[PDB]
From Swiss-Prot:
Organism of derivation: Equus caballus (Horse)
UniProt-recorded name of the protein: Myoglobin
EC number(s) per entry: 1.7.-.-, 1.11.1.-
GO BP terms: oxygen transport; removal of superoxide radicals
Top-level EC class as recorded in UniProt: oxidoreductase
Domain Globin per the UniProt entry, residue ranges: 1-147
Keywords noted in UniProt: Cytoplasm, Heme, Iron, Metal-binding, Muscle protein, Oxidoreductase, Oxygen transport, Phosphoprotein, Transport
Assembly, per entry: Monomeric.
Phosphoserine PTM positions: S3
GO molecular function, one term: oxygen carrier activity
Binding site for heme b: H93
Catalytic activity: Fe(III)-heme b-[protein] + nitric oxide + H2O = Fe(II)-heme b-[protein] + nitrite + 2 H(+); H2O2 + AH2 = A + 2 H2O
């Protein structure tokens, strides 16, 4: 549950992402894959990437980063009223991709890391607080659907 002022912070931060969605999305995925190499194994189309240089050179990885961040941005812009947008993603991630909730925690922290790396000194404590709460809400609503499905 976020206040109006917290949502305002989230959507202000998101403007930084929307200025370069592909660059942010690329770096988010690289932070996830290099920090948590088991996550790469869930992607049949990226498992061939052995080095970070290959990850950086991959145009398809940047494309997928755009897909991921476009979806998250659509959810965040709903300011919590995201049941219709979140349901298909919870269902596909539990039943087809088999993504444990832990990996959604990993990517949430990766987003925070990338924002500080690309905007050092321009991602303040209030903005970090609000972004963190928004990603927690996203993860928590996914977790509820995972429990419904019995997925671990
Ligand atoms: C911010 C969180 C994330 C968002 C919004 C997101 C969004 C999406 C979207 C929109 C798709 C394509 C449509 C679909 O299959 O439902 C997708 C595909 C996928 N997601 Fe996620 N995702 C997230 C996190 C993750 C994480 C943490 C993993 C694994 C560690 C992952 C693994 C996958 C895989 C395996 C695919 C299929 C890729 C393919 O072969 O084309 N996702 N995701």
């Amino acid at each position: 549950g976020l206040s109006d002022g917290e949502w305002q912070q989230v959507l202000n931060v998101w403007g930084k992402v929307e200025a370069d969605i592909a660059g942010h999305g690329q770096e988010v995925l690289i932070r996830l894959f290099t920090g948590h190499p088991e996550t790469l194994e869930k992607f049949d189309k990226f498992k061939h990437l052995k080095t970070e240089a290959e990850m950086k050179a991959s145009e398809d990885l940047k494309k997928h980063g755009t897909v991921v961040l476009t979806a998250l941005g659509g959810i965040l812009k709903k300011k919590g009223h995201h049941e219709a947008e979140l349901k298909p993603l919870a269902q596909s991630h539990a039943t087809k991709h088999k993504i444990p909730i832990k990996y959604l925690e990993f990517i949430s922290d990766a987003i925070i890391h990338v924002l500080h790396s690309k905007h050092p000194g321009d991602f303040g404590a209030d903005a970090q607080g609000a972004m963190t709460k928004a990603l927690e809400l996203f993860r928590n609503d996914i977790a509820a659907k995972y429990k419904e499905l019995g997925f671990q």
